[PDB]
Design a protein around this ligand. Structure first.
Ligand SMILES: *CC(=O)N1CCN(Cc2cnc(Cc3ccccc3)s2)CC1
Ligand SMILES: *CC(=O)N1CCN(Cc2cnc(Cc3ccccc3)s2)CC1
Lengths: 304, 304
């Protein structure tokens, strides 16, 4: 028993982290097979970041300008190309620690682990969610760009995020491993405001199910509701609308606990309307939304 | 910017996890050099756990009864011994992935990362703290025993915890790597109640400093207090007494923010007395106590 904000084991990803330096900028790269992926803003000076023309800046760079170091050994760059907002640096050596992998583009509400790195070296691992406004709330200092987000399915690492920037409000933006930003963000030091950071309703319900499985049951009430009634309340509280797809995904949790999804929605509705009254659920005084239904099943079952 | 509950990268520890089976019980083992460490209750049947005499049960076990598997390859056991509540299984092969390591016994209030494992395979990593009542609030299912807690200092892993049991209240108990339980707990299926789970005051103050460094400043007030006055309030709220040693340890955070430790104590005193009033600090609606002052400095500076 017990329920924790749990990250995937990071070993498979640690073996892929490298340092990439172009001129005076050093950030992280992801080395998979004979390609190193990194944010294209590694070619920028702090002056360039204000309004960079990446194609033009890249013309002044040659393979030998990209210094790639894996541990304390230098990798030989034999090609370079820009794919959207990432650079792909072809090296002459395949990463011998390359795990089975995929590049996936996640949907808002999906969680993933981040291996925060500096100078190609891992500093820590934590769990994030792609917010409904396409930002993530991470922990990233200067030098952390190029750190990646991922999920693991037994032995296959699905990379979903590469860190590129921090908005003026302290929230984070990045791309998938094809270099496409999540949301409307651009790799430019310009006015970029995030939209409404709504709560991931389906995740909150999954976490309420985890609470029941782990013994926290005070919030269970004698009520039920409908999808439409619940959604009127969810709209009022800046929660994402709950769909039949979300109800279906919560089916295994509903089956395990014997609590119908709509009954849990009515418990959530009362928590939104009445608050916690100074009480806690799974050690939290707020409704946690960074556990998906899959995460709750995975953690409550013990998938390795 | 941003502040997350961050675990150490788990790769160095993943390379040490093995499966240990004795009869019908399978749990995790830690393989360092040519020794595999595991909870001694691996020799128990569910019937034995009620009142086990470990020395007597161990007499009926031989080296060949301890099945140790690292990945899909079997390790040859050439010796076995009991040290307190752990068994040390000498194998004929040194773990080629053994990192630089130490065995440390932590004090309450200290944090560490846990690599939750099942059948010698890593499932996830999360951050814990040794509670003042010597329990930890983990996420452990049956089969997770033998999973370990650790800290890392650059390339040296300091192992501090091995998981042994869950109390009837859903909290966890275990040993250091010398096999001595933290607290008064015993490896027996018997009535073991935990003492008061008080809040780790020095950790809360460190986390308030992290909040200020990361932009959350609403809770800063116009007041100050003294150690004795603050401690009268801390006693009332089941917070650990703050000592001059704790004040000294908070010195670098005080210096970085320009907020004197006693002024932060006065902010904490008002938060205890008035509550949060529906507001949050670093995404939390409660005062977080599982970040030490060292953790805050480490994360806010980017140590790898
Ligand atoms: C996320 C990440 O690692 N990066 C993107 C943001 N930059 C910010 C900086 C750029 N240059 C720096 C050093 C400097 C400061 C002032 C004048 C000249 C150079 S920090 C870091 C990389
Ligand atoms: C923490 C950990 O991994 N362990 C300590 C607690 N045991 C509990 C169990 C013991 N035997 C089990 C299977 C069984 C159930 C009922 C009757 C006979 C066998 S679960 C697991 C290991």
């Amino acid at each position: 028993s017990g329920f924790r904000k749990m990250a995937f084991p990071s070993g498979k990803v640690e073996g892929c982290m490298v340092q990439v330096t172009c001129g005076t900028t050093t950030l992280n790269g992801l080395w998979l097979d004979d390609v190193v992926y990194c944010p294209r803003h590694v070619i920028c000076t702090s002056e360039d970041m204000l309004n960079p023309n990446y194609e033009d800046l890249l013309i002044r760079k040659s393979n030998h300008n990209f210094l790639v170091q894996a541990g304390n050994v230098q990798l030989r760059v034999i090609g370079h190309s820009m794919q959207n907002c990432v650079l792909k640096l072809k090296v002459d050596t395949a990463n011998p620690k390359t795990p089975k992998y995929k590049f996936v583009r996640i949907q808002p509400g999906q969680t993933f682990s981040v291996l925060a790195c500096y100078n190609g070296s891992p500093s820590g691992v934590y769990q994030c969610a792609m917010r409904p406004n396409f930002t993530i709330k991470g922990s990233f200092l200067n030098g952390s760009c190029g750190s990646v987000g991922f999920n693991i399915d037994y032995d296959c690492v699905s990379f979903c995020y590469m860190h590129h920037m921090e908005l003026p409000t302290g929230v984070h933006a990045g791309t998938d491993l094809e270099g496409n930003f999540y949301g409307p963000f651009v790799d430019r030091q310009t006015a970029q405001a995030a939209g409404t950071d709504t709560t991931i309703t389906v995740n909150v319900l999954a976490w309420l199910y985890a609470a029941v499985i782990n013994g926290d049951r005070w919030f269970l009430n004698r009520f039920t509701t409908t999808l439409n009634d619940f959604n009127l309340v969810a709209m009022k509280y800046n929660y994402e609308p709950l769909t039949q797809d979300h109800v279906d995904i919560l089916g295994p949790l509903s089956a395990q606990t014997g609590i119908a999804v709509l009954d849990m929605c009515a418990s959530l509705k009362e928590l939104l309307q009445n608050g916690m009254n100074g009480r806690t659920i799974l050690g939290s005084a707020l409704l946690e939304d960074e556990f998906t239904p899959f995460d709750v099943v995975r953690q409550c079952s013990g998938v390795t």
